[PDB]
Design a protein around this ligand. Sequence first.
Ligand SMILES: Nc1ncnc2c1ncn2[C@@H]1O[C@H](COP(=O)(O)OP(=O)(O)NP(=O)(O)O)[C@@H](O)[C@H]1O
Ligand SMILES: Nc1ncnc2c1ncn2[C@@H]1O[C@H](COP(=O)(O)OP(=O)(O)NP(=O)(O)O)[C@@H](O)[C@H]1O
Ligand SMILES: [Mg+2]
Ligand SMILES: [Mg+2]
Ligand SMILES: [Mg+2]
Ligand SMILES: [Mg+2]
Lengths: 338, 343
Amino acid sequence: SKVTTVVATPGQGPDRPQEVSYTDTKVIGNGSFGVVYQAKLCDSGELVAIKKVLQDKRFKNRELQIMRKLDHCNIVRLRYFFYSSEVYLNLVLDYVPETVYRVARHYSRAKQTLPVIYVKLYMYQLFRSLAYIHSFGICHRDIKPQNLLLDPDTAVLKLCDFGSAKQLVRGEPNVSYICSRYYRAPELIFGATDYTSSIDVWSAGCVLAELLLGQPIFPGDSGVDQLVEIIKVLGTPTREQIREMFKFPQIKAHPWTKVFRPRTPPEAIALCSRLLEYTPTARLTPLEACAHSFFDELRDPNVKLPNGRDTPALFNFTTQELSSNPPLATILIPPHAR
Amino acid sequence: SKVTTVVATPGQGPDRPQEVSYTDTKVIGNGSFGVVYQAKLCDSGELVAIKKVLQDKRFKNRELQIMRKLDHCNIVRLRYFFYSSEVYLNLVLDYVPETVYRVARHYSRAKQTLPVIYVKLYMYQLFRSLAYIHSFGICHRDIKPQNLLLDPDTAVLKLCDFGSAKQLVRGEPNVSYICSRYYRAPELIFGATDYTSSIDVWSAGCVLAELLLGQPIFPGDSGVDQLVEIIKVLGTPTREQIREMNPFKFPQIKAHPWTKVFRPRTPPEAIALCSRLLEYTPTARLTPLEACAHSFFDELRDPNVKLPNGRDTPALFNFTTQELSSNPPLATILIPPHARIQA
Ligand SMILES: Nc1ncnc2c1ncn2[C@@H]1O[C@H](COP(=O)(O)OP(=O)(O)NP(=O)(O)O)[C@@H](O)[C@H]1O
Ligand SMILES: Nc1ncnc2c1ncn2[C@@H]1O[C@H](COP(=O)(O)OP(=O)(O)NP(=O)(O)O)[C@@H](O)[C@H]1O
Ligand SMILES: [Mg+2]
Ligand SMILES: [Mg+2]
Ligand SMILES: [Mg+2]
Ligand SMILES: [Mg+2]
């Protein structure tokens, strides 16, 4: 089979390029402005994903600059990057077999819901990844099931796709047309330009709700439809809430408990209500979300995956990761963990 | 079977309540905030559609107020309206069997595309409905295949769903979150608040392109994706063009030759029409009346034009003074010689 050899620069560390050979290339994904392939590294045999995007040589690639700064167990790792050819930038990433999207779809069209233990594991790891990037001022801006990679057997989740990510800086305006439909925060729908990283939290909340319901909680082909669905659940925004973020129906909130199926864990519902809040500043921070009681089972000395394996890394927090509220380490790192 | 009798107010004319009895009610449509039923009138056995929406006791219904002013052969007719019960407003409309959406989906999954003669008829009638509402300053704001009703046998198209419509007043700001995904004008994606009725033209262009392609021309789950698809076709917006849409870090891509965008043997005139509809600069897009006069529709003006099934085409030239008001002279092109024959 065709063997390709390039001189690629390690994602992290010093700019010291090395020769890398790979083979067995096959498209495994796309995107409006991208193509992803899977390939096997010739020496290690490890599988990698290679994201190829047209790059304007005259400028710096933001996705690349952001990924080079990230080192977290819940964020897909950038192994190397290299150019090829119009010039293309190629991001060689760790290969991850699944997405929360594909997995959720399996349960949905099987008429079942993902067991709660997995909802806990996946959401907890997503919030860890968010606490980490937010600590650098980086907002992902495209949190959705398709960007959440999963390894089925280890239950490890890895946030991926930083093509919409950006460091948010007070006073600077940001485009409001980022983020996928169903997962957009209300302020985004209203065209806000001074939004914060809390838009990622709203999205995380939509993912949680969706994993619990078996379908998107705020569907809709237009912004107006999405606003209506949001309003049918949260109730009409008070004027003050709208300001924080109007020809809309005056509707009373729908009992969060009646939104979900009966049997849905109370803690899960409570978490949702603290994520999907109109007022951006009232939503939990990702670190606070990790500490929520819904995740207490993950901190149980005896929890194990359904396949019998131990849970993946969950407590290896760093100072960087806890910076938004250090005292939470008392909750986040159980007595038995190290 | 159950018979429902209600007292309803006429759509237009004197407010003289009518008593209406209908049966065989069944759901035929939905909306995040609505439900449409089909019903059979007891007297004539005619079918009608009834759009039921919750009504703010505290406001007047804009969709209703707008529909009461419309009288056009390419706009679904509001027959009566009445309240029922929380209070609901019920709009009784003429029943139309199909949508451009369903028709297009059938051809698309059958690996076909509808005869261009239908593309001409549907688009022409859509542009007539737009020239008419725009002449009143009314912008639909939700032009998409599902809101284009069709009668398969007569080939008559009727614009429906004025739940997003609004009279655009210069100097006034408007929400940018209206309009379905694939059909949103770029200025809407950029969050413009001072957009005009030309956003309906962009949408009409997306419908045309989609009818020609067999699928949406600018798909995408996020605004960014849509902008990329738009850019892959139109090319990167110039500095000035960005200022026209109003309210940018996208790769510089050159325009894709429109001809290369559509299947082989797509009519040149169709492609040309698209290019004049899907323009970045809002003011550069054709007006709907100008669109009706485009050469792509010349065949509809031919005296011997017939529907494939052999019938005559629907009325196409009964233009009113209101319809032509945006540019009266165009009538020299819009009303063909044979249609001016007194006989
Ligand atoms: N490291 C990886 N391992 C395995 N599959 C991957 C990896 N990275 C991307 N993919 C897959 O390819 C798809 C598209 O990759 P992605 O990075 O998100 O491209 P994109 O163009 O930025 N996408 P988007 O803007 O979300 O439409 C993902 O949803 C995954 O299913
Ligand atoms: N006069 C009619 N005759 C037959 N079917 C109709 C009629 N009006 C509406 N429908 C159907 O019902 C669907 C929904 O009606 P619609 O008026 O658009 O509700 P809506 O809540 O405003 N929809 P939307 O905002 O587009 O999601 C339409 O797309 C048609 O398929
Ligand atoms: Mg993605
Ligand atoms: Mg992306
Ligand atoms: Mg509709
Ligand atoms: Mg509507």
